[PDB]
């Protein structure tokens, strides 16, 4: 039955990325912003290799990102959709049923502005999934998800439009 309870779409995780191009104080302040927003200690990502054009070097701490799950993820997601005034594009949804957008100022989310911190843009990605994804993530007897149980672009688009009364553009 296509109308089964366990086929319900719901958020798996939200990942917040700030890729400041350098290392040091600015990356530390981006990490402070992320720890402020999520309430969790974020994790810093190192450059996989050296590019002179971008001014980065291998193993230099470049970006910072954090993963949030549960009610807090929902709150942050709607707080970020408010900044987007609930209007994404069709191009924002991947073929695997996940979607993301990017804000440009972190004070638009609704947190206090500090002159010392400044303003950072931010990258939002939401990983969608139904119940039973633990099969692909557990240690013992790991398997794959059936085709009907897979998350795709159309189901995620329809679910977002229904659950948020928003518009998904396509320009």
């Amino acid at each position: 039955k296509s109308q089964n309870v366990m086929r319900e779409l719901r958020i798996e995780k939200l990942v917040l990325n700030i890729c400041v191009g350098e290392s040091g104080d600015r990356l530390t302040r981006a990490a402070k912003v992320l720890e402020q927003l999520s309430g969790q200690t974020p994790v810093q990502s190192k450059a996989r290799y050296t590019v002179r054009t971008f001014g980065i070097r291998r193993n230099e701490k470049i970006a910072v990102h954090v993963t949030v799950r549960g009610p807090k993820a929902e709150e942050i997601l709607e707080r970020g959709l408010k900044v987007k005034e609930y209007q994404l594009r069709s191009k924002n949804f991947s073929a695997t049923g996940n979607f993301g957008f990017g804000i440009d100022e972190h004070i638009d989310l609704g947190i206090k502005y500090d002159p010392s911190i400044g303003i950072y843009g931010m990258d939002f990605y939401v990983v969608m999934g139904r119940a039973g994804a633990r099969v692909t993530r557990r240690k013992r007897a790991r398997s794959t998800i059936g085709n009907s149980h897979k998350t795709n672009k159309e189901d995620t688009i329809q679910w977002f439009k229904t659950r948020y009364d928003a518009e998904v553009l396509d320009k």
Binding site: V43, Q44, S45
Partner: peptide, 23 residues
Amino acid sequence: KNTSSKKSDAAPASADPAKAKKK
């Protein structure tokens, strides 16, 4: 605090293929 650990093995990379200019 906490930092990402190297899942990959391209230790002596320092660059990458496919990254071709004019492309």
